[PDB]
Structures are given as structure tokens and as C-alpha cells.
Amino acid sequence: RPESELIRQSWRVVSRSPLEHGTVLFARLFALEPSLLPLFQYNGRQFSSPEDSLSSPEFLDHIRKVMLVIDAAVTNVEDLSSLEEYLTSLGRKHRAVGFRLSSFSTVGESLLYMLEKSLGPDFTPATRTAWSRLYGAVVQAMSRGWDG
Numbered sequence: 269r270p271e272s273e274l275i276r277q278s279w280r281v282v283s284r285s286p287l288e289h290g291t292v293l294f295a296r297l298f299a300l301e302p303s304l305l306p307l308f309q310y311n312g313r314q315f316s317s318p319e320d321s322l323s324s325p326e327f328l329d330h331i332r333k334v335m336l337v338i339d340a341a342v343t344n345v346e347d348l349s350s351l352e353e354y355l356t357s358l359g360r361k362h363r364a365v366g367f368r369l370s371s372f373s374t375v376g377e378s379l380l381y382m383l384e385k386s387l388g389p390d391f392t393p394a395t396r397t398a399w400s401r402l403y404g405a406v407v408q409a410m411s412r413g414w415d416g
């Protein structure tokens with residue numbers, strides 16, 4: 269559609285600087301859901317405060333991964349069936365880390381925030397709506413790693 273392009277166009281801006289943008293996504297996410305923070309367990313140490321996470325290179329790496337999955341979702345915005353099977357298994361990985369199912373919606377409100385703050389006025393409600401459809405779909409796929 270033209271929604272696919274709303275997405276492509278918004279993303280444009282964000283993949284200039286994906287860590288920086290994802291840094292935003294995650295800080296927002298911890299602000300909204302602090303109980304997520306212990307789920308990263310690099311060396312079986314638990315970050316004590318959000319800012320600790322920002323000093324973890326493993327964590328920053330997880331940001332890069334997040335943004336690359338999202339990036340794959342944008343590339344395939346036309347048909348997200350092509351990455352259903354990947355995303356399903358990726359949801360399974362997340363099941364295993366202790367991630368609740370409810371927590372996806374936060375991750376999604378985090379991404380939106382991040383887009384909204386990056387695009388300011390360009391972040392029109394058709395844009396909120398498109399991303400939300402995209403991310404909604406990513407989660408649908410991901411949720412099938414809780415299958416039942």
C-alpha cells in the first residue's frame with residue numbers, strides 16, 4: 269500500500285543511528301516496565317539499575333539485534349509471512365528468558381515512543397497506526413513461541 273511507505277519512510281530516519289535510537293527504546297522500556305531489567309543476565313549478574321544496562325556491551329548488542337529484526341520487518345513490510353517462522357522461534361527464545369507475554373505491548377509502546385521522538389511532527393497518526401500494525405504483526409508471530 270502507501271502505509272508500507274509510511275513505515276519505510278519513518279524507518280529511514282531511525283536506521284541512520286540504530287543503537288542510538290534503540291538506546292531510546294530500551295530506556296523508555298525500563299522506565300515503563302522496570303521488572304524487565306533482570307531478564308538480561310550476562311555472566312549471571314543482574315543489572316541493578318537501568319543505567320547499568322547501558323554500560324553492558326552485551327546489552328548494547330541486544331539493542332543492535334532488536335533493531336535488525338525490526339529492520340527485517342520493515343524490509344518485508346509487504347509480506348511478513350516470509351519472516352513468521354524466524355519470529356516464531358525468536359518468541360520461543362524470549363519465552364525461555366522469562367519474558368511475559370504482556371511485556372510485548374510495552375516493547376511496542378517503547379518503539380513507538382522512540383519513533384515519535386525521532387520523527388516529531390513527521391510522526392503522523394497514519395504513521396502511529398502503520399507501525400502499530402507492523403509491530404502488532406511481529407508480536408503475533410513472536411507469540412506463537414508460547415503456542416497454546
Ligand code: HEM
Nearest residue numbers: 297304307308309326329330333334337338361365367375
Ligand atoms: C524488550 C524486551 C526484551 C528482553 C527483556 C529481551 C531479552 C533478551 C535476552 C536475555 C536475550 C538473550 C541474550 C542476548 O542474545 O543478548 C535475547 C536474545 C535476542 N533478542 Fe531479545 N529481549 C527483548 C526483546 C526483543 C525484541 C522485541 C526483539 C526483536 C524484535 C529481540 C531480539 C532478540 C534477538 C534477535 C536475540 C538473539 C536471539 C537468538 O538466539 O537468535 N529481543 N533477548
